[PDB]
Design a protein around this ligand. Structure first.
Ligand SMILES: NC(=O)C1=CN([C@@H]2O[C@H](COP(=O)(O)OP(=O)(O)OC[C@H]3O[C@@H](n4cnc5c(N)ncnc54)[C@H](OP(=O)(O)O)[C@@H]3O)[C@@H](O)[C@H]2O)C=CC1
Ligand SMILES: NC(=O)C1=CN([C@@H]2O[C@H](COP(=O)(O)OP(=O)(O)OC[C@H]3O[C@@H](n4cnc5c(N)ncnc54)[C@H](OP(=O)(O)O)[C@@H]3O)[C@@H](O)[C@H]2O)C=CC1
Ligand SMILES: NC(=O)C1=CN([C@@H]2O[C@H](COP(=O)(O)OP(=O)(O)OC[C@H]3O[C@@H](n4cnc5c(N)ncnc54)[C@H](OP(=O)(O)O)[C@@H]3O)[C@@H](O)[C@H]2O)C=CC1
Ligand SMILES: Nc1nc2c(ncn2[C@@H]2O[C@H](COP(=O)(O)OP(=O)(O)OP(=O)(O)O)[C@@H](O)[C@H]2O)c(=O)[nH]1
Ligand SMILES: Nc1nc2c(ncn2[C@@H]2O[C@H](COP(=O)(O)OP(=O)(O)OP(=O)(O)O)[C@@H](O)[C@H]2O)c(=O)[nH]1
Ligand SMILES: Nc1nc2c(ncn2[C@@H]2O[C@H](COP(=O)(O)OP(=O)(O)OP(=O)(O)O)[C@@H](O)[C@H]2O)c(=O)[nH]1
Ligand SMILES: Nc1nc2c(ncn2[C@@H]2O[C@H](COP(=O)(O)OP(=O)(O)OP(=O)(O)O)[C@@H](O)[C@H]2O)c(=O)[nH]1
Ligand SMILES: N[C@@H](CCC(=O)O)C(=O)O
Ligand SMILES: N[C@@H](CCC(=O)O)C(=O)O
Ligand SMILES: N[C@@H](CCC(=O)O)C(=O)O
Lengths: 501, 125, 501, 501
């Protein structure tokens, strides 16, 4: 962000990894099966961690496209595959002028550790195309996407069993449609799983309910899991719950907008919203719905009638919770002194530098880390991939059977009681509550996504708190998450004997 | 499948090579694959050999197969193994005995009481 | 490696390309059968040249190996594919600590243009592994080589119809054997052309006669084609021919040793040899055999009894012809003022910076450029690939038929003359000269390699001379070669309509 | 069979291998590159020879067919691949009740060493189906063949670049047609080389001129190369040449009939012919043409009008040359004392036991060994495979250009002499002899099969003679052949580093 506050993104994530490696090193050496404790054990542990951290594969591309006015342009693209310790690699595609090999490797490694934290059986990957999509027509972006797909597919950097992309900054449903159609019409014409080659697809194409809003819905769940912990909310000097709290979100895209929709729903009040244009502000609250309608209509948030063009940086606005939901390295050493919030919920990937971490720790500011908090996108992408593999809408085969079963179950209770308390207890109707009537046919896809997401966001939160307490890490939840991620990944390399995976 | 060696006479380094190689020769001739032929442990092989088999398969012929790790069973749990495979054969030895040891019709021809609480056994191996 | 004579290798080769592009730009715009100028024709031309310049594909690798001690090491590797305008890419593998993405991209592009100069139907590629092979056992190097092969094969960066590697610095026959065996035993088990996946193989494995010495044999042919040109030898102030000239060679490896073997054979005098150790010197001549025998025996050329340890840089030694046959960027701006030879024969790839080119021009020093002079290696690798595709030793099917044919041909002349000048002439024996008796059965593989190489080195030389005369380039033969390479490559992008090739 | 004269066919060929290994062991240790002559050289050499001996792969098959009357029948089949040191394995298919794993492994190893003797770049393989084809209809044999092909193809035991079968006993043109059609219509439908999956095909079907007679034509050439060697014919006490010698052939099938056709053509007289039925005899000569006509007409040779039913074993008939052209192990310990002939030309594979070798040596009987003498079939099969790879009839592109070229060559001589000896010389016509006129368009496919075969039969004979002298092996030409074969195969294992080839 600043100058000399601007570390190498990949090394910075390596630093987070090293932090966590220091703390579990003893525990890893502990539960080793192996021969003689010459702590050659210790060196074996440290050799495996050396294998995990670098990317295994990075493809760099140049390829031409023919612009709308007839000119030729060369555009560059990358896709890094950080780890294959679990076989389909997973990670999004970013269209931005900031894309580099540097940045794509960093995000690929975050994907590996994030999947381990939430227990999604994917290795990490990430792709980037070095363009500003503002400067291209829809016709041009289709050509760029379709061709990026074919160059990746010929070199084994996309495929249902190899590497499954997804949306990231400046890509969405529409690009994923183009990726899936290009794959399933060329290399994947005979693959029964061709459409599992990418996630974030439109629902009419093998998409899944809620994937668009999935990352924000998991930002809500991850904040709620900590905002309702008395142990943590006391060190921060705050009341548990949402009903009284304010937040600011940087970024009004896929992550920002839905984070703000869900927190607003549960009582919290949106105080400030920012984009690259600038920010808006209103201490009385901003409504997500009418702000979205405004942006859709005018292409900017600036000039929203029910708020204030805020001069003075979103990141330092006064609120309880600050949600970075845009680029990386937004909270720096020069920046953290004024942050004025007590909870930093990283919706973005890598939005805080290590020395901003130092500061936040000694002001008792809680950073809910990216590799836990934004993992809702990859969790629901995992559900979408599973759905394509199965070729049925969840519940489709069982709705009627379930509904009938549950009525006969309840009827069994009714008839059993009528038998006992016979003739002059009369009729004892056993009927579903209003809530059970909703579930009477069993889960649909929407139900699976919702409760599946909530289950893993909370199982993961409680593993991070368990770990932070056991190593006495206070509010350094980032280190706790990496400790968890490292332990999971390390076990696969143990039994395997490495050499590859 | 069978390999004519006595594994006690080999180092772990040597057994890894034997196993990884045996896998490749089988895979080239279509004698291992998720939809073709799925090996498993037997005498003197276990979790460890099954790891080597799955890794060798999924890193060569099966690099693009979404089901590469279904090429062998008995794998360690951290590797796509399943809970209880190690003890599975004995747990089914227990169930298969109990299904007959509680059958009065059969336990009578044998002159025995139903149930386990009063019986001795010997195991070879 | 110094501090401000040390340009980015890939950009530097781009610069050589740009000069050549300047000069043919008019001639490319000329022969365009397309609609009419609007000088959209001119924009089309430099849009195509913009597509040719960058590498299409670069794979970066990390993978672990088990050292002999039991320790784990991560080693890096790269392979760039510069162009697919001709389908099998071609280029060597370098094991060196100087290997990087930009070094591998630079060498890959030189391979494209060198193949075009000599009319070998391959696109350019190059691989690198970032190790110093002197620090590894043969066991360890086997491992590294066989790994590197499998990682390349899974991602389509090696294959008979995709990308065919070859030796480079610190690799040879032995590594090529490991590469071919690993390929043909895994991914290529059913490919009838599996052993065409790499060239430079041992003869017993589908190698071809003379590949080892092929680069030096083409260094000799390329010097001889210019050393016997009165027009050029006059601007330099020298006598045509080899019989009176001295040379120094930097590098005593695959290129250096055989360059020095062949020049010594045709009368020239080797005055100095260098390696990384240092150099040796003797103005009376060094013999290539006994120097080779000494190196094989002691592992160094320092201390050769028949010469004396030269202190003072082999590149400035006093000779007629200087042969850089080692690393790149050896002749720099700080260096060229004292070069003291009048012919610089670039056996190595990229051994002169652009800044040193400027100087050598003004001093009337003739640089025979790499993309012409060292192309003997890829020319004979092309023959080896063809041989593997055909599955016969040249001549095998025809030796006897050919030998019998030629004797009946000669007998036809004999009997025809005996018929006419009847018995006043007796017997008129028609028999082969001693030289025809050698060819009586037609060419063998050795004959094909020898005369095939001489034919292309010579045709290519005269193409460069014509071009240098027709644009009045003087001794800037480097620009003439790039003009030729650009014309050949541009030809394919024209009719194709680009978009993929 | 012969009771306690009846060794394990595979072990017996291993024994032949071992005697050759004895003799070159010193030589092999000689030209090893490598470092420590520590008597670890010697152990490497033996370790490599231990790898070469055993078959790498043996597929055993059971599969059902429905017989013509509706009954089901399981039939067994095998195919052994002895070596992959050269990539397409090669070897025939035998339909016989004597087929076993041990017979198929023995013949497969013979194929490896025979291909090495004649320098055909194939590893050895052999298949067998355990039936007596005289007990099946043509309908039934088609189903057995087409099915045997599919079971081999699914497990990678047939394919143009894997394993290429051919005829053997009781199979021919017809079966090879069925094999090629089954392959090219299922697994090979997209393979440009599908029809190179088997050799011995009918000419209309991608077969090659002379494959049918090729084995006998090479029997003739291999006898002729030794029958015209004064050095050898003197130890036997015979006159060089064919014009005054008799021979007997056991087996009147593919090998026997054509061996007898070619020897009869060059003056030798056929004295006795045998099959499983029995034999016929006439010291006065048997004509191959009319004997063939009789067999085609009556299905047996017994009762040929111009000969008498011989009762007393054709192997002991009184002749100069005995040609075993049927099964293996036909000349035994109990048998060799009475053999009567001075030259045993092994057309069959493995027709002589090792103990019969011992005897023949001490009676100064010359055994021309199988791995040299019958290698004409695989030599011309190699030509057929090459032909299918090239997709042109030899000469097709060049006939007219050759003819024209040869006329103008000759005209150059004519005009050159006319200008020198001007007027008083008149016209000096230069015209082809009658022999050159046949050749004037260059070789056809027939010409290359003929002269190609003669070239390799002769080059191989000399190499055996050279070797038998360098080791003072007398008439033990079998050991000389194995010495040659072992040297060539050992080559490939040296540079390779073994582990897969
Ligand atoms: N896409 C997904 O589903 C997931 C994304 N993430 C991470 O979340 C972040 C973005 O996600 P996403 O919402 O998809 O990207 P989008 O393009 O959907 O939205 C990006 C938002 O960030 C804004 N933005 C970009 N740069 C800046 C900046 N320097 N200052 C302020 N606002 C900025 C854009 O506004 P403008 O148009 O004004 O630039 C836009 O509103 C990245 O870190 C990404 O890796 C993580 C998990 C899932
Ligand atoms: N290999 C081939 O077939 C072809 C190679 N080339 C180019 O030729 C050059 C070398 O080829 P090759 O002969 O194969 O390489 P080798 O590794 O075979 O031999 C290299 C020689 O160069 C010497 N050398 C290396 N670095 C230096 C240095 N910094 N200063 C002085 N001497 C040095 C080495 O000496 P030491 O042992 O002391 O390092 C060794 O004598 C490279 O540029 C290569 O790309 C071009 C065409 C074909
Ligand atoms: N086929 C080839 O191209 C080559 C074959 N060989 C070897 O040569 C032999 C095959 O010759 P081929 O002509 O191909 O086979 P065929 O089946 O074509 O002819 C076989 C001949 O041998 C006769 N025969 C079989 N067993 C006996 C026996 N025990 N005693 C006497 N005669 C017998 C058959 O008689 P009936 O007709 O009554 O069975 C028939 O006349 C085998 O050893 C084979 O491996 C080696 C190199 C090339
Ligand atoms: N961009 C945008 N998306 C919306 C809006 N309202 C609903 N959605 C999304 O559209 C999809 C379908 O809506 P619903 O069926 O109501 O979703 P839901 O499962 O009930 O849960 P929610 O996501 O909380 O609405 C869900 O993913 C919503 O998140 C909106 O106002 N703007
Ligand atoms: N060798 C050995 N294996 C054990 C022992 N206890 C459990 N296991 C096996 O380890 C696996 C995990 O064990 P648990 O965590 O106890 O789960 P479980 O299904 O209750 O195990 P069991 O009922 O004992 O089979 C199961 O397959 C057990 O059979 C033990 O004491 N010794
Ligand atoms: N390193 C090295 N290579 C040699 C030497 N002599 C010959 N060679 C190379 O080894 C191969 C075999 O050499 P030859 O049998 O003489 O065939 P050639 O084609 O006439 O060899 P040259 O013309 O000398 O290159 C050829 O590639 C030679 O260039 C030598 O003394 N040292
Ligand atoms: N079975 C059999 N084959 C024959 C006979 N005569 C010729 N052939 C073969 O049929 C093929 C075609 O015959 P030709 O036109 O004479 O060809 P060729 O090259 O002149 O044949 P040869 O010199 O006899 O080997 C050749 O392979 C001959 O060997 C015969 O009488 N019986
Ligand atoms: N860009 C998303 C991708 C998630 C997915 O692969 O679905 C992330 O950072 O997690
Ligand atoms: N390194 C060699 C390799 C040539 C080849 O591909 O054979 C070169 O620079 O040309
Ligand atoms: N059975 C023949 C077949 C040769 C071939 O492969 O064509 C032999 O023994 O040599």
């Amino acid at each position: 962000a600043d100058r000399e506050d601007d570390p190498n993104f990949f090394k910075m994530v390596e630093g987070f990894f090293d932090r966590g490696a220091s703390i579990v090193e003893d525990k890893l050496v502990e539960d080793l099966k192996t021969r003689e404790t010459e702590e050659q054990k210790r060196n074996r542990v440290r050799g495996i961690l050396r294998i995990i951290k670098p990317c295994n594969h990075v493809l760099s591309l140049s390829f031409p496209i023919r612009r709308d006015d007839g000119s030729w342009e060369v555009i560059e693209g990358y896709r890094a595959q950080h780890s294959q310790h679990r076989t389909p690699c997973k990670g999004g595609i970013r269209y931005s002028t900031d894309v580099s090999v540097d940045e794509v490797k960093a995000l690929a490694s975050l994907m590996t550790y994030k999947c381990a934290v939430v227990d999604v059986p994917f290795g990490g990957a990430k792709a980037g195309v070095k363009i500003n999509p503002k400067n291209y027509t829809d016709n041009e972006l289709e050509k760029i996407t379709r061709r990026f797909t074919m160059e990746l597919a010929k070199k084994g950097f996309i495929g249902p069993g190899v590497d499954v992309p997804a949306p990231d900054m400046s890509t969405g449903e529409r690009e994923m449609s183009w990726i899936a159609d290009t794959y399933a019409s060329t290399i994947g014409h005979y693959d029964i799983n061709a459409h599992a080659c990418v996630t974030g697809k439109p629902i009419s194409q093998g998409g899944i309910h809620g994937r668009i809003s999935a990352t924000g819905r998991g930002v809500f769940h991850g904040i709620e899991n900590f905002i309702n912990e008395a142990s943590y909310m006391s060190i921060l000097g705050m009341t548990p719950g949402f009903g009284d709290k304010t937040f600011a979100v940087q970024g009004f895209g896929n992550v920002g907008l839905h984070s703000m929709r869900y927190l607003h729903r549960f009582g919290a009040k949106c105080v400030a919203v920012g984009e690259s244009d600038g920010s808006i502000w209103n201490p009385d609250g901003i409504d997500p719905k009418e702000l979205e309608d405004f942006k859709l209509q005018h292409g900017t948030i600036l000039g929203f009638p029910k708020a204030k063009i805020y001069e003075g940086s979103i990141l330092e606005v006064d609120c309880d919770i600050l949600i970075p939901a845009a680029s990386e390295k937004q909270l720096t050493k020069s920046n953290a002194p004024r942050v004025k919030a007590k909870i930093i919920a990283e919706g973005a990937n890598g939005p805080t530098t290590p020395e901003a971490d130092k500061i936040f720790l000694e002001r008792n500011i809680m950073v809910i880390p990216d590799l836990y908090l934004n993992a809702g996108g990859v969790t629901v992408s995992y559900f979408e991939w599973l759905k394509n593999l199965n070729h049925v809408s969840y519940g489709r085969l069982t709705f009627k059977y379930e509904r009938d079963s549950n009525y006969h179950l309840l009827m069994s209770v009714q008839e059993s009681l009528e038998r006992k308390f016979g003739k002059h207890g009369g009729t004892i109707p056993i009927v579903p509550t209003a809530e059970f009537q909703d579930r009477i046919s069993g889960a649909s896809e929407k139900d699976i996504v919702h409760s599946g997401l909530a289950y893993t966001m909370e199982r993961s939160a409680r593993q991070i708190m368990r770990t932070a307490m056991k190593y006495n890490l206070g509010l350094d939840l980032r280190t706790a998450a990496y400790v968890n991620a490292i332990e999971k990944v390390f076990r696969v390399y143990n039994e395997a004997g490495v050499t590859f995976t």
